[PDB]
Structures are given as structure tokens and as C-alpha cells.
């Protein structure tokens, strides 16, 4: 029977680091300057004259660790007790949430389906749009069928093919396949399905 041929819409190729993709590059960039800033402010404010400098554990290296474990939501063994230290902790906890909860979410939007809609079967979509040109072999049963049949979709396809310009027809199946391959997906060729399968 009659059948349609079009260009294959490629095949999917994941990266190695595809898990980074549900957040844009610039988020993964700015979140590092965020971590650096939060750490260095928490240090500036913790080790400030208590008047007793020995009072407080939040040296540079312990500030840099505390803010890491908090962003991973993986706990700690110290916490700030000064009011000025508690406000810088409390703001970093609120950021952490909105961000780590939006990765988990978007990851799933993807993990649902990834498919290309394509022309729907029965090729009725060839009657719905001017975006794809189509044609037939010169002097073949398919051309006479389209000329003759009063099936309204096929009659409309004929009315297109008998009114489109420049000439859409081809002299051989080889030229038909070439006009498929080269036309950047904007053309489809109509040919006998037992000849279609050999091409594929």
C-alpha cells in the first residue's frame, strides 16, 4: 500500500553529567559565591571582641564546614548562640530550602517522557498545513490514484500537488529519496511501502 517517508529525527544521547542539567549554568556559578560570602560573614561576626577571645569555636575552618553541612541538609555538631550569629544562620537555611526543593521537583518534570510528536499516522496532517511539500512519481499508479480518488483528504492533497509550484514530482524513486534526504525535513515522498522498507 501507499506510505510516507521523512527524515529520522535523530536519537537521544545523554551526557555523562546529565544530572546537572535541570538547573542552569549560572545557578551553579552564583551558588558558590553565595557559599563563600555566607562563610566569610559568619566568621567576621562570630570571632568579634566578646568584651574572652577563647569563647567561640566558629573559627574560619569551622564556619566553612558548618555552612556546607547545612546546605547538604546533613546536620552539624555546633550552632551559633550570639544574636548576630543566629540571623546569618537563619537566612542561609531559608535559601537552602527553596533551592534544593526545586531541583528535586524539576528533575521529575523530565523523568516523566521525551518524545517528538512527529506527523500522525494516516498522514492526515499533510492536508492540514503548507509546511511540508509532497509529490509522487511521474506516471505511476499512485499519481492516478490521487488524481482520481474523491476521498476528500486525498482530493485535497491532489489539489495541492496539482497547484503547488515549482513542480514537486520526480522521475525516479532515487530522486524521490534524494528530495527527502536533502530538503531539510520540509518534503515528504509518497511511494509504495514495499519499496519504502528497502530504503530503511
Amino acid at each position: 500500500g501507499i506510505s510516507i517517508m521523512i527524515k529520522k529525527p535523530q536519537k537521544s544521547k545523554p551526557g555523562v553529567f546529565s544530572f546537572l542539567d535541570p538547573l542552569a549554568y549560572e545557578i551553579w556559578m552564583c551558588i558558590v559565591f553565595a557559599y563563600i560570602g555566607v562563610s566569610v560573614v559568619l566568621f567576621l561576626v562570630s570571632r568579634f571582641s566578646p568584651y574572652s577571645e577563647s569563647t567561640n569555636e566558629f573559627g574560619i575552618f569551622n564556619s566553612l564546614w558548618f555552612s556546607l553541612g547545612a546546605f547538604m541538609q546533613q546536620g552539624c555538631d555546633i550552632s551559633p548562640r550570639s544574636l548576630s550569629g543566629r540571623i546569618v544562620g537563619g537566612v542561609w537555611w531559608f535559601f537552602t530550602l527553596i533551592i534544593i526543593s526545586s531541583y528535586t521537583a524539576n528533575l521529575a518534570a523530565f523523568l516523566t517522557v521525551e518524545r517528538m510528536v512527529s506527523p500522525i499516522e494516516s498522514a492526515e496532517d499533510l492536508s492540514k498545513q503548507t509546511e511540508i511539500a509532497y509529490g509522487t512519481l511521474d506516471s505511476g499508479s499512485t499519481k492516478e490514484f490521487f488524481r482520481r480518488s474523491k476521498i476528500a483528504v486525498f482530493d485535497k492533497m491532489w489539489t495541492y500537488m496539482r497547484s503547488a509550484e515549482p513542480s514537486v514530482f520526480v522521475r525516479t524513486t532515487a530522486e524521490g529519496v534524494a528530495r527527502v534526504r536533502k530538503s531539510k525535513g520540509k518534503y515528504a515522498y509518497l511511494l509504495e511501502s514495499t519499496m519504502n522498507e528497502y530504503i530503511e
Binding site: D21, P22, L23, A24, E26, I27, C30, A34, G37, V38, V41, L44, V45, F48, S49, Y51, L83, S84, I87, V88, G90, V91, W92, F94, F95, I98, I99, S102, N106, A109, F110, V117, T130
Partner: protein
């Protein structure tokens, strides 16, 4: 209807937007930097109050 072309004819597929652009989330950074800017002020006024 055979001669309409604008996306009002069909645009219902509504595939996902890719990734998640920064402009959707920028508001979260401003309150962060404002809190960092407030903590230092509170620290300095507490300092100049205590050491006097």
C-alpha cells in the same frame, strides 16, 4: 480555517521548558544579601554599645 497559520490554530503540546533560568529565582538572593548586610550592622551597634 484552511488558511490560518498562527499558533492559535494549535499550540497545546506544552512540552517542558528546558532547565530553570536564573531570572526565575533571583529574588531568593536579594533577601540573602540583605540579611548578610543587616547582621553586620547589628553586630557593630552591639559592639559600640558594649565596649563603652
Amino acid at each position: 480555517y484552511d488558511k490560518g497559520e498562527c499558533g492559535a490554530k494549535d499550540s497545546g503540546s506544552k512540552e517542558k521548558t528546558s532547565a530553570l533560568s536564573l531570572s526565575n529565582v533571583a529574588g531568593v538572593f536579594y533577601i540573602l544579601v540583605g540579611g548578610l548586610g543587616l547582621a553586620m550592622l547589628v553586630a557593630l551597634i552591639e559592639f559600640c554599645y558594649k565596649s563603652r
